[PDB]
Amino acid sequence: GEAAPYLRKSEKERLEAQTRPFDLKKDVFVPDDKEEFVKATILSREGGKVTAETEHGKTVTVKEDQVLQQNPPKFDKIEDMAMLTFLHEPAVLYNLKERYASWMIYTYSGLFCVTINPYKWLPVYNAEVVAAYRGKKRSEAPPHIFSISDNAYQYMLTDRENQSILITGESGAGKTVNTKRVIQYFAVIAALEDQIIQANPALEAFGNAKTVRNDNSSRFGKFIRIHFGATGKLASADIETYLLEKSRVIFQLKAERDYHIFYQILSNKKPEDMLLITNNPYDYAFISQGETTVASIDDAEELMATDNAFDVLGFTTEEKNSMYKLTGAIMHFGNMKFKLKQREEQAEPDGTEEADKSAYLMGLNSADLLKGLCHPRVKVGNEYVTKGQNVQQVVYAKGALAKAVYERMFNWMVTRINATLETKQPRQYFIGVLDIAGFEIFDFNSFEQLCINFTNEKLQQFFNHHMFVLEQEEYKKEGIEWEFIDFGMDLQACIDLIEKPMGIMSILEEECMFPKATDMTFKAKLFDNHLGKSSNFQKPRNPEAHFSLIHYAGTVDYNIIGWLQKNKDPLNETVVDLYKKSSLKMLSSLFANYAGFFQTVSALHRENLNKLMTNLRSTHPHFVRCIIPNETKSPGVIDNPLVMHQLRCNGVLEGIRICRKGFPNRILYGDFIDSRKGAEKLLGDIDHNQYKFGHTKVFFKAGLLGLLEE
Ligand SMILES: Nc1ncnc2c1ncn2[C@@H]1O[C@H](COP(=O)(O)OP(=O)(O)O)[C@@H](O)[C@H]1O
Ligand SMILES: [Mg+2]
């Protein structure tokens, strides 16, 4: 057989009808003062178009020049949108809807792939499918992330250059689950190295958690590069982490959860007591707020999934019991007294079981830590002063240790993981796979949310910078003297407002170095600098005292609390000095090592990202746009304003234009005197018209080289 008999591949891609209602019936998509349209039979035409509608009445002349019509049902449910005769928001949504209701999540849009989250597990990712997709053309194979990932792999071999697959989506849009299959494809294409497959579910327990927008929400940016040699066999794999929401460990909002790991460990009877663990909620204060479990997910069976990944990847039984002794101690640090010696402002713990956290966490003196937290030694100039803190500052310092201990342990995981995957025989060509923490909007948005929205903005900029601006620069002289066409999409203004002089980051860094500086001080400084000046900055009126920032994906209001403390994440030297001199070997490396763990958090993320974007530019990009159908995390429901504006901000429609208007195919006088003339040498039975050049020939349309190969 092949991909032609009606079984599994043909079953899960399109379906035939038996009634053909076609004829000369022409239609138009019409709304009702909102972005929600219905079909309408066109009744009359001259200067405008009289449309019947019949849905709640009839005739309405007002169509004219705007109009924007319905495409023949012949196109309805097509695979590539650059094929549609009429192109606009309703015409595009309907084709994506027609496919979705037939459980076809993938659709092509000019070049870049489009994926609408199903919120149900579709059987389209099988070994039988990976094999059915091995080395097959875009025209030869229907839309699928296995085709896009194959095309990238083929291009890194045919063009001999680095490739990068870039996935673009909001929180819960399918980025992680797509990234998961791109790596799943290559291990059973070019490749033991099963571990590459096991690295992601090991960074899922410690790295992913439950938000109101996603149950397995990636609380970190991930750059996974799959290494290849000369022939194209799997040489290695390198992973990089980004803005980890380490504040989630000490605090979670209503209905949310902490990292999966905490819930998984309490569920497993490994000490069967030694770690002094008990029940998931109640007892542990860093967990007992909102919820304990996620629907249709087993916290007992998930630690069986991660212990499997640790033992596969080379983590020994002692290393495991070390990592869990940390997790069990973060939970143990979570229950402190911090009462009062003198009822004014002197903190004092009235005998607690912190001698048990001190037991699990590398046998640190129980008499110490108590002193290292309550009374930590500072210095005024050259004088070693002893500070006697208050209940609030003791809580924040306790938290400082929890967040520090955790992030540093998570960063160690990646170092230990890469000292398995990356370490083999690396060099040559490679496939980069981006899985960034998607565009977030909540009731309370703090520092980490701004960090996220900056990453999402700059990644979206890279899509605008590559689809248009870069393409149009090449068209300048060589093309049809290129008009040129102008697209309203420009996210540099909102970027400049966040970073470069003058920007939010710079204004914030200046306040960390400043001693008198407080939260109330620098929100005033922000307003002083950006209100009534920048149009993409907004100062809430008499809402609150926070600040609003306009993005491609919409405006966000960010609350200022912590922020200065978040940016200059401080851990008292006494608590650092306390942990270096400890029993357990694992946390000894978490404080004694310097090569791996002053620089302000915002400047580090700014530069981590700078570094990331500079890698990508030296790579050939492949875009995947993840569209979320709804906000109730439910299958079968595709909402009109939710989807119709993800495409509006993603620049999906304009990305079909220039792919249609301009010249997507560029070449010289090779790969075909033997070859020099674009008109003369190619004139020898069909076409001979849709192209253009001046010098450094030729610039052809997408619908010419597709037939030249076929
Ligand atoms: N292609 C897909 N097939 C099946 N389920 C999917 C798919 N994409 C996403 N999901 C579901 O939606 C959830 C949210 O997607 P996810 O990849 O975790 O988010 P994000 O895009 O933010 O990284 C997943 O936990 C999974 O249940
Ligand atoms: Mg994710």
Author numbering: 10 to 200, 216 to 296, 299 to 568, 573 to 627, 644 to 718, 736 to 747, 750 to 775
Sentences from the paper on this structure:
In cardiac muscle, cardiac myosin comprises, in part, the thick filament of the cardiac sarcomere and powers cardiac contractility. The force produced by myosin motors is generated by coupling the sequential release of the products of ATP hydrolysis (Phosphate (Pi) and ADP) to a series of strong actin-binding states and the swing of a distal elongated domain of myosin called the lever arm. Omecamtiv mecarbil (OM) is a selective, small-molecule cardiac myosin activator that binds to the catalytic domain of myosin and increases cardiac contractility in preclinical models without affecting cardiac myocyte intracellular calcium concentrations or myocardial oxygen consumption. Here, we describe a previously unseen conformation of the bovine cardiac myosin motor in the PPS state that OM stabilizes and binds to with high affinity.
Comparison of the structures with and without drug bound reveals that the OM-binding pocket is actually not completely formed in the APO-MD-PPS structure. Interestingly, in the presence of OM, the lever arm adopts a primed lever arm position that is close to that previously observed for scallop myosin II, while the cardiac apo PPS structure has a lever arm position slightly less primed, with concerted changes in the relay and the converter position. Comparison of these two cardiac PPS structures reveals that drug binding does not significantly alter the structure of the motor domain. The two motor domains of OM-S1-PPS and APO-MD-PPS structures can be superimposed overall with a root-mean-square deviation (r.m.s.d.) of 0.88 Å for 557 Cα atoms between the OM bound and APO structures and with a r.m.s.d. of 1.33 Å for 593 Cα atoms if the relay and converter are also taken into consideration. Importantly, our structures indicate that OM does not change the conformations that the motor domain explores during the motor cycle but acts by increasing the stability of the states with lever arm primed.
